[PDB]
Amino acid sequence: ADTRIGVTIYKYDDCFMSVVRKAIEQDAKAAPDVQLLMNDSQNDQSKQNDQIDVLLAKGVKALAINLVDPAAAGTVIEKARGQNVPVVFFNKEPSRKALDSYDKAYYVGTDSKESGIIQGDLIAKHWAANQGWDLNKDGQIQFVLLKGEPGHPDAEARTTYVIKELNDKGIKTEQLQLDTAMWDTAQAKDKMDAWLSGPNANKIEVVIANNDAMAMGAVEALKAHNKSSIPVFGVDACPEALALVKSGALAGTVLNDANNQAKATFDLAKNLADGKGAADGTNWKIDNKVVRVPYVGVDKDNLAEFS
Ligand SMILES: OC[C@H]1O[C@@H](O)[C@H](O)[C@@H](O)[C@@H]1O
Numbered sequence: 562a563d564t565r566i567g568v569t570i571y572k573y574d575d576c577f578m579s580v581v582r583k584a585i586e587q588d589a590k591a592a593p594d595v596q597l598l599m600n601d602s603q604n605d606q607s608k609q610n611d612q613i614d615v616l617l618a619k620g621v622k623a624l625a626i627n628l629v630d631p632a633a634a635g636t637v638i639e640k641a642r643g644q645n646v647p648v649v650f651f652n653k654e655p656s657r658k659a660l661d662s663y664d665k666a667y668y669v670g671t672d673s674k675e676s677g678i679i680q681g682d683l684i685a686k687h688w689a690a691n692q693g694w695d696l697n698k699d700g701q702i703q704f705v706l707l708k709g710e711p712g713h714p715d716a717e718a719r720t721t722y723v724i725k726e727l728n729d730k731g732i733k734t735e736q737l738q739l740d741t742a743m744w745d746t747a748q749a750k751d752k753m754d755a756w757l758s759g760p761n762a763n764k765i766e767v768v769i770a771n772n773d774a775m776a777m778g779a780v781e782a783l784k785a786h787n788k789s790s791i792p793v794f795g796v797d798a799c800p801e802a803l804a805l806v807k808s809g810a811l812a813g814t815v816l817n818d819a820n821n822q823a824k825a826t827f828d829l830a831k832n833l834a835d836g837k838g839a840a841d842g843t844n845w846k847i848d849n850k851v852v853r854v855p856y857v858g859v860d861k862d863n864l865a866e867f868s
């Protein structure tokens with residue numbers, strides 16, 4: 562009969578996870594034997610926990626879980642273990658210890674630091690090509706940074722590695738501001754607006770955001786202050802962001818490959834639901850229960866390949 566797979570998305574109103582959610586539903590449409598039970602956890606781990614209980618009570622044969630809280634992986638694993646059901650975590654990466662605590666736990670995502678390195682290289686390229694961006698002519702990038710959720714592996718790695726990569730390439734940096742905007746456009750717009758309204762706003766040379774949603778908020782705040790001359794960099798290559806790379810409102814971004822992350826999540830979940838090896842009949846390379854999908858930098862010079 563039909564194989565039910567339970568899926569939780571941490572919040573449907575996340576740009577990137579909306580792409581992933583839709584892609585996984587398209588993938589399921591192409592598997593006549595599988596029924597997806599899709600849940601919006603509304604950015605609340607307690608809601609997600611209850612949703613998982615309901616899915617397990619409905620007899621799902623696998624779970625695909627996009628955690629609200631990464632630290633809740635253990636909690637979720639113990640729920641799955643109660644039914645001896647496999648779980649494919651995706652996009653918010655559990656700790657190695659959590660993954661190793663249950664032989665039926667897997668993870669699909671990315672090499673988080675790669676996105677930071679790529680973003681840093683993009684900034685380095687554009688900085689070298691636009692020395693007018695060095696407003697105070699000190700040879701250093703005076704930056705502000707809009708961080709994702711504290712503790713989220715992508716937020717932590719993108720924040721560390723964008724700056725490390727710039728510095729390693731011989732570009733000194735001065736952090737003027739850094740705060741979280743929780744992956745959200747409105748929070749980022751308000752934070753950027755505050756920074757532009759504070760004393761020494763005039764020192765800001767480059768805006769770095771851990772994702773496109775926050776970058777797009779910054780773009781709007783810059784526009785409101787007639788400061789669009791300041792470049793903004795993001796991560797994801799969300800559809801709206803690519804339009805802004807085209808228009809010049811966004812200086813660069815980094816494709817976070819939602820389509821392939823969705824496909825790997827679905828393929829592994831379906832195999833595990835069927836009691837097969839996770840990668841059976843696929844080309845996915847699973848390394849110690851993890852699949853990582855490459856990022857790719859995007860700017861006007863290669864936009865034609867992504868538009
Ligand atoms: O967990 C959700 C987050 O995942 C990250 O990989 C994406 O870059 C963000 O846009 C998204 O908000």
Ligand SMILES: [Ca+2]
Nearest residue numbers: 695699701703
């Ligand atoms: Ca400078």
